[PDB]
Amino acid sequence: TNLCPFDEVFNATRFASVYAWNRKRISNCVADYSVLYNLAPFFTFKCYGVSPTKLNDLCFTNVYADSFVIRGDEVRQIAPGQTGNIADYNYKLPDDFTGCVIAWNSNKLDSKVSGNYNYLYRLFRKSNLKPFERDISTEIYQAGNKPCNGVAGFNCYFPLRSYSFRPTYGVGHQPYRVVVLSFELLHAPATVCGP
């Protein structure tokens, strides 16, 4: 009975930014997806490709858990074939994605009266993101025709901005924690299902 920790993923004391989402590899496991309903009314639990209805009895080579925090309005953008700031510049899912997406509200933890500026996101970029790609570069975006020279100014903006969460915000502006589980089947012994 080797149970690898989804507790270090779902119950982490702190999550990551959407532009710097955390990826974790999980293998050699007894994967128990049956007991995951231990969160405060978790609004979103949607699986694509694999049926959520007790289809946990299938053996996978590896699992990836990707964790980040967004606001309530962009939770719809974590899905195949979606367009937006998060879907294009921060975190992109493939059109043929197979896996699950779990999103739950986090107002009681991530919100502060004076504002929570820790969480950031990317607002400007030259081109969209390839599926499952990450960008961390902080080079300032160039909108005009003159060189930026690494200094903010006219038509030269810092690509990263902050959410600045507060407890008095609306439901659509409140923080939401998102975990994406991605399943692979490869040419390998595929030793991650678990009874």
Binding site: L123, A143, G144, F154, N155, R161, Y169, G170, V171, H173
Partner: protein, 596 residues
């Protein structure tokens, strides 16, 4: 990259930063208004200064994008709203001079003390001292004394300040590519760049005068009736063909005529509909009233209210140590934060005020998805009109009986409808000639058609020909009678009170048309009419993105302000006034004066 992409990127940045800063400023202002402490004062001042500095810096930065090369008519609207060079065009000396002048105007108006003769200690302010005197006291001498004292003590100090204000505002208007300050004020309704919906700044004057020409007969018949009733009340002070005296109009300036209702009721033996005792019997409280309002708004298909609205808004007076301004307002702090500040009492007036601010909140929630610079009403009249139509609909006897407030054994008889229509006309119809006269006089003053030394010389011919009011005491150039009003002394436009009146009646007839109402329009109700709710929401969701002509056509099918619904609203009242005044002279004379 073209200029349009640069403008789009800059607007995205401005939307983000302005949203954050505006939310902070609004939250600080709300904390001050709900809790009057000096620390809250300093926090509000700091937040306002930061927001103003950010807005000025962003306007200066956006000035570098010329308007001509931006298509799509949406980025152009935001750039126009952002540039707004304003008073900063003139020299800093003139800017600080105008700031000081307006500050002195506000200080003089707010701290105006009127002291009774023979005792320079029993001095009174506008509120609640002289307001109660001019709204409740029926004594001729006291009202005349208050009228003369206010027009003599306050206006004379403001006269040179008003002249300098007018001159420098004309300078700003000429510096901002406008004909005059009146043109700058009228520029709100201007629409450009859309075929079939263009509106010109000069068209507003033509529309207003055209509508007032059609309104005139009903107001004239009402004036004759009020003159007859005042004669029955004051036989020794009104001429058979002369105009009504200024200080017998129910309030300080004659803007509203509601205070004469107790004097001008035709059938005093039939009490009006007052359900305050009914709410007392069922022990209704403020939260119950707001739940009823939310139920009414849901019945037409409009959505719920956010939980933050119930958690954060202060619906009752806190009393004790916590002091706050009890002026009922609706606050849209941004980022999904909507609140209502109201000192609710158990009174039908507060019952209607709840619906009024609930409609304001619904309108604010409608366009929350628009960009930051496009979250307003299509013009300055739609917002309050949408607020007013819900209050009009909620006050009908049918709705009161539907919620159990009125006993089912209440049968309507035409005496009650006549009284209700007269009460409504004493407020709505009475203020239209005053609004038109004041706006036309200010437009002429700013335009320069009215010479300086003949300001007041002109001011009193319109009062006799437009609103039919004659002064009790002649006033020379020393007095400044107009500045005694709050709006002109604080430099606010006054035409928004006219168009709104002609909007709230165009909506209702359309809305009642969706509910298939049968019978008189004044007994309509839009409850349980989800079709009407969708029809109204289709316009509420637009915001400032589309021209106001298109928004108006979306609901009523017309691109221009129309007055036919307003006259259709008062048709039985019009017939009753015609029947009553068939045996009385119709019109007035501009030569008679109470002072001879």
């Amino acid at each position: 990259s073209t200029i349009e992409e640069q403008a789009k990127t800059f607007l995205d940045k401005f939307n983000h930063e302005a949203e954050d800063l505006f939310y902070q400023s609004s939250l600080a202002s709300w904390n001050y208004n709900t809790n009057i402490t000096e620390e809250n004062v300093q926090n509000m001042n700091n937040a306002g200064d930061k927001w103003s500095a950010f807005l000025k810096e962003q306007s200066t930065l956006a000035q570098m994008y010329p308007l001509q090369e931006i298509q799509n008519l949406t980025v152009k609207l935001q750039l126009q709203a952002l540039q707004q060079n304003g008073s900063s065009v003139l020299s800093e000396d003139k800017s600080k001079r105008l700031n000081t002048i307006l500050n002195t105007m506000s200080t003089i108006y707010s701290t105006g003390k009127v002291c009774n003769p023979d005792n320079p200690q029993e001095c009174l302010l506008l509120e609640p001292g002289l307001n109660e005197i001019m709204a409740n006291s029926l004594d001729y001498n006291e009202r005349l004394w208050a009228w003369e004292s206010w027009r003599s003590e306050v206006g004379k100090q403001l006269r040179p300040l008003y002249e300098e204000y007018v001159v420098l505002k004309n300078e700003m208007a000429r510096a901002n590519h406008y004909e005059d300050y009146g043109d700058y004020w009228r520029g709100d309704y201007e629409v450009n760049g859309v075929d079939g919906y263009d509106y010109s700044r000069g068209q507003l004057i033509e529309d207003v005068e055209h509508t007032f020409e059609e309104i005139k007969p009903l107001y004239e018949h009402l004036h004759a009736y009020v003159r007859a009733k005042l004669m029955n009340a004051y036989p020794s002070y009104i001429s058979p063909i002369g105009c009504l005296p200024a200080h017998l109009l129910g309030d300080m300036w004659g803007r509203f005529w509601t205070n004469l209702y107790s004097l001008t009721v035709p059938f005093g033996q039939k009490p009006n509909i007052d359900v305050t005792d009914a709410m007392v019997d069922q022990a209704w409280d403020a939260q119950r009233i707001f739940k009823e309002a939310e139920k009414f708004f849901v019945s037409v298909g409009l959505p719920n209210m956010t939980q933050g609205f119930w958690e954060n808004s202060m619906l009752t007076d806190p009393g004790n140590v916590q002091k706050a301004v009890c002026h009922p307002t609706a606050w849209d702090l941004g980022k999904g934060d909507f609140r209502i500040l109201m000192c609710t009492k158990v009174t039908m007036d507060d019952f209607l005020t709840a619906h009024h601010e609930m409609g304001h909140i619904q309108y604010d929630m409608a366009y929350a998805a628009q960009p930051f610079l496009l979250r307003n009403g299509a013009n300055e009249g739609f917002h309050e009109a949408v607020g007013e139509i819900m209050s009009l609909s909620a006050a009908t006897p049918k709705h009161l009986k539907s919620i159990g407030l009125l006993s089912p054994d209440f049968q309507e008889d035409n005496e009650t409808e006549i009284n209700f229509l007269l009460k409504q006309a004493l407020t709505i119809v009475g203020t239209l000639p005053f609004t038109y006269m004041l706006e036309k006089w200010r437009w002429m003053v700013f335009k320069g058609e009215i010479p300086k030394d003949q300001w007041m010389k002109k001011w009193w011919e319109m009062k006799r020909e437009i609103v039919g009011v004659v002064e009790p005491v002649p006033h020379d150039e020393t007095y400044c009678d107009p500045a005694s009003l709050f709006h002109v002394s604080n430099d606010y436009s006054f035409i928004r009170y006219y168009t709104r009146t002609l909007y709230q009646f165009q909506f209702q007839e359309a809305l009642c048309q969706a509910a298939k109402h049968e019978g008189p329009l004044h007994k309509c109700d839009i409850s349980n009419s989800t079709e009407a709710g969708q029809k109204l929401f289709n316009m509420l969701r637009l915001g400032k993105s589309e021209p106001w002509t298109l928004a108006l056509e979306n609901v009523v099918g017309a691109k221009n302000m129309n007055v036919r619904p307003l006259l259709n609203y008062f048709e039985p009242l019009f017939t009753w006034l015609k029947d009553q005044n068939k045996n009385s002279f119709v019109g007035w004379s501009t030569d008679w004066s109470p002072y001879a």
